[PDB]
Design a protein around this ligand. Structure first.
Ligand code: SF4
Ligand code: ZN
Ligand code: ZN
Lengths: 49, 210, 760
């Protein structure tokens, strides 16, 4: 799976479906509004399941 | 509240995040437990650099840099004086240079010789304690008073907005319920054709809402 | 097709139109006669981009006075590519009709992620690191050191563009990002700086929202261009959300710890450069005292970071206070950092207005207001001064400095809200600090001041009564265009009734109710057994999709959905979503059945569009309410009660319906596309929530379809698909839902197009 995500990518990311870079100006969690999107904390048992 | 930990009597900041640190003349660190444990064992002897504390020379604040505490306290004691606003100078460059002179005096009292600094303070403090320093004490007191008044005016307006929208909701709810119960007690005990009385009820509802 | 749109010839790049098309063209002639803004609503049926670019090119071909430049603004980079290639189709039609008498400089423009060449910058994956290495390899000072030596680092692209490339404008060629990169490869240039330098010569420029509405990026379209410019936003539902994302600032404890490390690093840099040099610091003190920090600002191309986040009209022209010596400015930032760090220590949620925070500052750490305004100018000038290379390392402190500017500029409209812990966190050490804004209007205000006529346009916008009531906005045209059809083309049903006659809802507020999730799974199963070729299923929140697809496994449902079609569940990775989308589109074409279930908020439904056979049945699970978010919602609603006049229960319903009908109305491309679009819970039938879906979906929402069961909805789906899988050829459209050349010149058709379009 990590080879499909890292060593490989989306082949038809040519004009659509490129979900990583479907935003021209992506920044860190600093100067935004919805910066609490992916939390490095809060890893539970049932949620990880 | 998660700093490296109290030096002498190391328990406070590591366990309790409910404290504050007090600085000394030399300016390093002392917590309340340090304060009391130090006062019982000398009352004015720095825990590390042994500076000769003049008289009880401790000040409790909440920051985690000693130079920050030093600059804050010295900056307050300097900006009690040197109160010439932009209103008080003729030009703008003189006001900005005056603020830079204040920064120079604060950094000189940080580390340099405190003699020429105190002589400069003597000259300016005398020459402007004649007129301007007390005048600006008065004006800053006026602006503090009016800012506290304006914040209380803001909070009165917010409480009135909350309570008036609550009374809007309760007035319309009780009033619509009394409209409906009155219309039922008038369908009972009157003698009219039905469509006219129901149109009067719908007129009551629309004149109530709209 | 040579349209007469009551004043002008228009070369439409197809030899057929819709009537909706020509109604849109009438109303946009109306908006460009009188210099006013106007909000349109063409649904997703027509080529609204095709029409839009056609008429703006007709005006620019016919009137070189009022309209200088079109600035299109579509939000995602694949839509940038789509609008550029439709403009390229229209230029190819335009040059088929006449010959090579074009001159017309179409131009895309995004960023250094998408226009950088250099094979050491290119393998970086992130925007700030590409910006940092581009700041390394070219600058105002590294470029000069290379200019009087040989082996110092340089790009060879920006240097060769500096050698010759700033005297030859790009001749009349419509350029994508790929074509522009290829021209940068060809002669050997930066196409990034070529694009920015060739903004001045274009006629259509197509960039994103944040490249226009951000005050700290959009310093590249000047006033004199803007006085005769026509800006056209596209897909403009979340304009207010873009503004609130564009001026609010988030501070975190990690940001402040890395700010402390930054402060110590810059202190050491000031010490060693004090051991090195003194003369340019004299020149610093000169250009602070003499000027207003504009001495070396003339040659400033890659020495510009993100500018001051105050707007264009609230900036000053004075001298920065007591700040001048960089030692004292490090003390200034030290004081501000320690006070904001102490303010963040409070272990309960605290809301303040920014003058209360300024007074708490100006009393307890002696920092006044005007040296707190000029902190952005000071940190940008200082950070230009000390020759330091990789500015990504200095991302927090600049943030903090920029935060200072906002605290010292705006009041009564914005709000400083401190959270010791987030909503989904509780009691984990994340104290954050939203300087949140809630004036939507204060970010589009220079967009209405500068520009001539900005045209908000989307396929869904409803109701149109509220976008003047939020954006401080008074348009010429408030238009809604009715879907005129010769074939039903869509059916919305409101499946708000379980098969056990259980009321389907999401009233529980993401804390699972079992039988409702059971009936959702039963809906998805039986709709899988009916619908072809890909079903799209939007949930409410990723916690709720998480919990639902959890309890579709322990309960025995999800293997049956596997038996009918192939699932592709969503995750909040940027690359895993793209792989799931790619396999979902390779399973709608290699025979089997594919079903993409996502969240109705994220990026899955913002740009990534589902066309003829990729989504046949858009299943909108639930009513999407923003339920996780904090007192930012309560505070923006208190604001819209107070200083605008928009109710609580009005704005919540408006926001929920713009998200729901945003995610639903992507399934349909043209008249020869059919999309089942179901709404699954009872609340979409309650009059106000149904009343705020757009008109072109309420027109086809029948009272019988209102509050169907699961199985009644399944039988309506079967009858829908069977009546709408037959040969619906072009000969069934020339009467009603299509127009020829000679079907336009009849005045009876003109009466029809008068009857179609309406205004609000
Ligand atoms: S100067 Fe041009 S080639 Fe060099 S990093 Fe920047 S965009 Fe890339
Ligand atoms: Zn102690
Ligand atoms: Zn000491």
């Amino acid at each position: 799976x990590x080879x499909x995500x890292x060593x490989x990518x989306x082949x038809x990311x040519x004009x659509x479906x490129x979900x990583x870079x479907x935003x021209x100006x992506x920044x860190x969690x600093x100067x935004x509004x919805x910066x609490x999107x992916x939390x490095x904390x809060x890893x539970x048992x049932x949620e990880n399941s | 509240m998660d700093d490296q930990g109290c030096p002498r009597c190391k328990t406070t900041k590591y366990r309790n995040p409910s404290l504050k640190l007090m600085v000394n003349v030399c300016g390093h660190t002392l917590c309340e437990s340090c304060v009391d444990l130090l006062f019982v064992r000398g009352a004015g002897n720095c825990p590390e650099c042994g500076t000769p504390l003049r008289k009880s020379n401790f000040r409790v604040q909440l920051f985690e840099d000693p130079t920050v505490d030093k600059e804050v306290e010295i900056r307050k004691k300097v900006l009690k004086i040197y109160n010439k606003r932009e209103e008080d100078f003729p030009s703008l460059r003189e006001y900005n240079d005056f603020l830079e002179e204040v920064e120079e005096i604060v950094f000189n009292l940080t580390n340099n010789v405190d003699l020429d600094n105190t002589k400069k303070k003597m000259e300016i403090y005398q020459k402007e304690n004649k007129d301007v320093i007390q005048k600006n004490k008065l004006k800053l007191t006026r602006e503090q008073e009016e800012l506290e008044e304006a914040l209380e005016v803001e909070r009165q307006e917010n409480e009135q907005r909350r309570l008036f929208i609550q009374k809007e909701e309760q007035l319309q709810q009780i009033l619509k319920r009394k409209n409906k119960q009155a219309f039922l007690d008038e369908l009972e005990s009157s003698d009219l054709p039905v469509a006219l009385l129901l149109a009067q009820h719908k007129d009551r509802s629309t004149q109530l809402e709209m | 097709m040579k349209l007469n749109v009551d004043g002008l010839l228009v070369y439409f790049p197809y030899d057929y139109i819709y009537p909706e098309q020509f109604s849109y063209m009438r109303e946009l002639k109306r908006t460009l006669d009188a210099k006013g803004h106007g909000v349109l609503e063409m649904p997703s049926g027509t080529g609204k981009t095709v029409s839009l670019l056609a008429l703006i090119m007709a005006y620019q071909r016919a009137y070189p006075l009022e309209v200088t430049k079109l600035i299109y603004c579509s939000r995602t980079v694949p839509e940038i590519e789509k609008v550029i290639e439709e403009l390229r189709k229209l230029l190819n039609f335009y040059e088929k009709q006449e010959g090579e008498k074009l001159p017309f400089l179409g131009l895309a423009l995004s960023s250094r992620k998408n226009l950088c060449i250099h094979p050491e910058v290119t393998p970086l994956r992130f925007g700030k690191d590409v910006d940092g290495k581009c700041h390394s390899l070219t600058a105002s000072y590294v470029r000069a050191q290379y200019q009087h030596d040989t082996s110092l680092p340089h790009c060879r692209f920006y240097e060769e563009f500096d050698a010759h490339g700033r005297e030859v404008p790009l001749p009349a060629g419509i350029y994508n990002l790929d074509d522009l990169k290829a021209l940068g490869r060809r002669q050997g240039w930066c196409p990034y700086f070529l694009a920015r330098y060739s903004i001045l010569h274009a006629n259509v420029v197509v960039y994103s929202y944040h490249y226009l509405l951000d005050p700290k990026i959009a310093d590249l379209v000047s006033k004199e261009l803007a006085r005769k410019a026509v800006v056209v936003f596209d897909e403009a539902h979340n304009i207010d959300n873009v503004c609130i994302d564009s001026m609010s600032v988030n501070l975190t404890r990690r940001t402040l710890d890395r700010c402390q490390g930054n402060l110590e690093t810059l202190q050491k840099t000031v010490l060693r450069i004090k051991e090195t040099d003194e003369q340019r610091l004299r020149d610093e003190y000169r250009r602070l005292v003499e000027g207003x920090x504009x001495x070396x600002x003339x040659x400033x191309x890659x020495x510009x970071x993100x500018x001051x986040x105050x707007x264009x009209x609230x900036x000053x022209x004075x001298v920065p206070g007591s700040i001048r010596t960089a030692e004292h400015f490090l003390g200034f930032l030290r004081r501000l950092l320690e006070y904001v760090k102490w303010r963040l220590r409070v272990q309960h949620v605290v809301q303040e207005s920014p003058p209360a925070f300024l007074s708490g500052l100006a009393q307890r750490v002696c920092i006044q207001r005007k040296p707190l305004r000029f902190c952005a100018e000071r940190l940008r000038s200082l950070l230009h001064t000390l020759e330091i290379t990789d500015l990504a390392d200095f991302s927090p402190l600049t943030l903090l400095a920029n935060f200072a500017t906002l605290v010292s500029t705006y009041a009564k409209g914005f709000t400083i809200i401190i959270e010791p812990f987030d909503d989904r966190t509780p009691t984990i050490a994340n104290p954050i600090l939203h300087f949140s804004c809630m004036d939507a209007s204060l970010a589009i205000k220079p967009v209405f001041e500068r520009f001539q006529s900005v045209i908000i346009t989307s396929g869904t916008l409803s109701p149109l009564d509220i976008y003047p009531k939020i954006l401080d906005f008074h348009p010429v045209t408030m238009a809604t265009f009715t879907m005129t059809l010769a074939r039903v083309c869509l059916c919305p049903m409101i499946i708000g009734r379980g098969n056990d006659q259980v009321a389907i809802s999401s009233k529980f507020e993401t804390r699972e109710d079992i039988a409702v999730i059971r009936n959702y799974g039963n809906l998805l199963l039986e709709m899988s057994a009916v619908v072809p070729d890909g079903i799209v299923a939007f949930f409410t929140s990723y916690q709720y999709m998480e919990s639902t697809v959890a309890s579709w496994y322990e309960q025995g449902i999800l293997e049956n959905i596997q038996r009918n079609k192939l699932l592709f569940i969503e995750t909040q990775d940027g690359a895993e979503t793209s792989v799931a989308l790619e396999k979902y589109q390779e399973a709608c074409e290699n025979g089997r059945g594919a079903i993409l279930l996502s969240v109705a908020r994220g990026k899955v439904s913002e740009g990534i569009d589902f066309v003829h056979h990729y989504g046949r049945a858009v299943i909108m699970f639930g009513v999407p309410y923003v339920y996780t978010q904090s007192r930012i919602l309560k505070a923006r609603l208190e604001y819209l009660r107070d200083q605008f006049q928009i109710r609580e229960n009005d704005f919540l319903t408006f926001d929920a319906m713009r998200h729901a009908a945003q995610c639903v109305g992507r399934a349909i491309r043209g008249k020869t596309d059919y999309g089942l679009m179901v709404f699954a819970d009872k609340r979409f039938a309650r009059g106000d929530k149904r009343g705020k879906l757009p008109r072109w979906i309420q027109e086809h929402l029948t009272d019988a379809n209102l509050n169907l069961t699961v199985d009644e909805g399944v039988q309506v789906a079967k009858y829908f698909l069977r009546q709408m899988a037959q040969p619906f050829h072009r000969e069934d459209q020339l009467g009603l839902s299509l127009l020829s050349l000679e079907q336009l010149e009849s005045e009876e058709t003109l009466k029809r197009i008068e009857q179609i379009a309406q205004q609000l």
